[PDB]
Structure formats: structure tokens, C-alpha cells
């Protein structure tokens, strides 16, 4: 059952597709096929290769009008190191003055970043519960809890210069708050002076852990 269109998806459109590296790449939608319970989308990548993909593994090659995205929306966004890569995630906050009109993204591996309105792309056919295709179960479970509770977001008030313990990979590290940016805090780990931007409601921050573990 070949199709030339699926709603707004049309054969020949520009698209992003997910590769097995989990990075996303520009290409062209070359076929739509009904296969079992749904549709498959064949993508020819600009650089190298052809993939047959599910609808949650393609994204539009345009930056959406900001108001079409919501907390919980499934997106691909720019993830910088240094490169620039496109990686999937979930919108955690929409643009407001307090965040300098940026989107907060929680990526599928648990990385967090603010991105601009021109640095994200909507996934075409996400799952209704958008987090159900997140492979990392700890990130999946976190996003379900976060989106379900939203707009209830307990956070710690931190100030530049404040010393706290911050968790990383099973150890609690002496650290310092360097900067606050909206719902993120830039933490300097004192043992090596590398930083990490962490959500101010994350229980990786000792004050937030302390509050959530009290009862």
C-alpha cells in the first residue's frame, strides 16, 4: 500500500530522519508505505544512505511557529559540542521573557539545554504519550513524571557562588553554582572545574534531593 501523501506529509518533501547513531540528518521523503499497523517513511539522506523509518523517527525540515509547540512536544534540536548535531528530545518549557524566549529541551539521553526558536524541528508523527519512545528508561520515566506534573515544578532557588553537592554518575560531588539561567543552573564541579547545566528541579542538586526525600 504505497501512498503519495499522509496528511501534510508528501512524497518529495524535505525531511530530517533519525540514523542508527541517534543523530538526525537532512534528506528527502521518497516514499510512504502502509506496513502492518501504520505507515513507514522512506528517506534518502543528502549526505549518505536510505532508511525506512517510523513516523516518530522523521521530523519536518522547518522551524515551527513557536506557538505550535507545547511542554511535552517531541522535537529534534541542536545539541552542541565544540560540532553541532541534531538529537531528539522533549520540550520542557516554551518561550517566555524569563527564559529569553527560548525553548528548554530535555534530550533523550537526559542532557538539558535552552535552544532558540530556529534550533528545533518538530517530529512528524510522535507517540501520543511522547516520552514512550525514549530508549533510556530513567529519562523516559523522568519525562513522564515531569510532563504529567507540569506546571507543578518544585525547584531550588540557587545563587551564584553558592556551594552545594551535585550528583553525577552515582557520586555526590562538591560543586559551586556559577550562573543561573531560567530553569537551569550552571554547576562547576570543584574537583576539576568542568561545568554542567542542570535543571533546578532535578534531584541531582542536593537541595532538591533533600526536599524530595523528606516526608
Amino acid at each position: 500500500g504505497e501512498l503519495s501523501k499522509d496528511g501534510d506529509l508528501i512524497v518529495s518533501m524535505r525531511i530530517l530522519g533519525k540514523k542508527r547513531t541517534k543523530t538526525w540528518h537532512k534528506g528527502t521523503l521518497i516514499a510512504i508505505q502502509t506496513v502492518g499497523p501504520g505507515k513507514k517513511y522512506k528517506v534518502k539522506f543528502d549526505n549518505k544512505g536510505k532508511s525506512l523509518l517510523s513516523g516518530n523517527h522523521i521530523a519536518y525540515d522547518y522551524h515551527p511557529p513557536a506557538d505550535k509547540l507545547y511542554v511535552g512536544s517531541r522535537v529534534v534540536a541542536k545539541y552542541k559540542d565544540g560540532q553541532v548535531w541534531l538529537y531528539a528530545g522533549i520540550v520542557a518549557e516554551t518561550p517566555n521573557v524569563k527564559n529569553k524566549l527560548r525553548f528548554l529541551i530535555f534530550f533523550d539521553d537526559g542532557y538539558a539545554s535552552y535552544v532558540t526558536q530556529s534550533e528545533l524541528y518538530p517530529i512528524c508523527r510522535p507517540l501520543k504519550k511522547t516520552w514512550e519512545d525514549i530508549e533510556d528508561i530513567s529519562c523516559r520515566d523522568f519525562i513522564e513524571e515531569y510532563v504529567t506534573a507540569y506546571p507543578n515544578r518544585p525547584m531550588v532557588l540557587l545563587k551564584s557562588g553558592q556551594l552545594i553537592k551535585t550528583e553525577w554518575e552515582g557520586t555526590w560531588w562538591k560543586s559551586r553554582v556559577e550562573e543561573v539561567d531560567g530553569s537551569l543552573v550552571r554547576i562547576l564541579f570543584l574537583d576539576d572545574k568542568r561545568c554542567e547545566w542542570i535543571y533546578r528541579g532535578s534531584t541531582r542538586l542536593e537541595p532538591m534531593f533533600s526536599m524530595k526525600t523528606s516526608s
Binding site: 539521553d109 538539558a112 530513567s138 519525562i143 550528583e167 553525577w168 554542567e196 534531584t203 534531593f209
Partner: peptide
């Protein structure tokens, strides 16, 4: 200069 992500919650 950043570490690899520690994710959103403490490791289990």
C-alpha cells in the same frame, strides 16, 4: 568545558 551529561535524576 563540560562533563558528559549526568541526566535528569541520580543514577539508580
Amino acid at each position: 568545558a563540560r562533563k558528559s551529561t549526568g541526566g535528569k535524576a541520580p543514577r539508580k
